[PDB]
Amino acid sequence: VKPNYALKFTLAGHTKAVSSVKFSPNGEWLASSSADKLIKIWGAYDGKFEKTISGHKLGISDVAWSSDSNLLVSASDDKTLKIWDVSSGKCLKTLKGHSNYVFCCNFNPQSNLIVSGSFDESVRIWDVKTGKCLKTLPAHSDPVSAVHFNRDGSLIVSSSYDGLCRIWDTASGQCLKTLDNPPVSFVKFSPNGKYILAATLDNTLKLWDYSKGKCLKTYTGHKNEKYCIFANFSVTGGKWIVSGSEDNLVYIWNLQTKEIVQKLQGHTDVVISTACHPTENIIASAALENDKTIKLWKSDC
Ligand SMILES: CC(=O)NCCCCc1nc(CO)c[nH]1
Ligand SMILES: [Cl-]
């Protein structure tokens, strides 16, 4: 069995590289962030442009949704994160404390906390209500490429150009585990929180068993030597691994067999970001500044 993702919509409007696309947990919306300093909201099902959210003074590297689909958080080169009310487009809080570009961000499942990763080599944990920094983790010895909460928010996983993935106890900020050392460009937990998916800048994705601390699966064939490209667990139909690539394609692998099952063609630059819809067999992909578009794809499985 293989998926049959086909192009449904091309979403134009960003004037520089797209950096990140994310579906709202309720499946209604796609949010995109860009080097153009803007967040854009789009209909997940009709691709219809909804609104622009503005206020960052420099480019945005990442955006993430609260669990109720009402709030966004953005990570910017202006060294801040901003918490946004999606309905009003208003900036509710500016999260200050990082000393360099903020690269990655995520809410916990409760959405009382935000985790951030920065070029300043720290991971910060923030109170959503107050906008205050609760904890600063001296997490890494190079820029932090990704941060992600597990299923209940009890753990954070971080990755860095220093070649490490680290698992952190959210409550205490203490490191529970460190996983050659090529730069780690992306990491996230599996939906069940038992596994970690990690990208390294040697054109390799690895599935790690967190409990055992050992590599279970490797996914190759794509190009990733430069950019922090997002990767995804696709779980709505077949059990796939999804990633962008520096050869301008979306790669889809069989999680169990590690075989490439589809390559999506259409982008005219690096596919930096992919997202999987929470309920439908729908992928969003976004590309860098030769392309600047988002594409919505639909599969029967
Ligand atoms: C250096 C690089 O990859 N620049 C392209 C724009 C940033 C993309 C991005 N990836 C992540 C992974 O967590 C967050 N943001
Ligand atoms: Cl996703």
Author numbering: 31 to 209, 213 to 334
Excerpt from the publication:
While binding of the butylamine was tolerated (28, KD = 350 μM), it also enabled the synthesis of a number of amides and carbamates with substituents aimed at more completely occupying the WIN binding site.
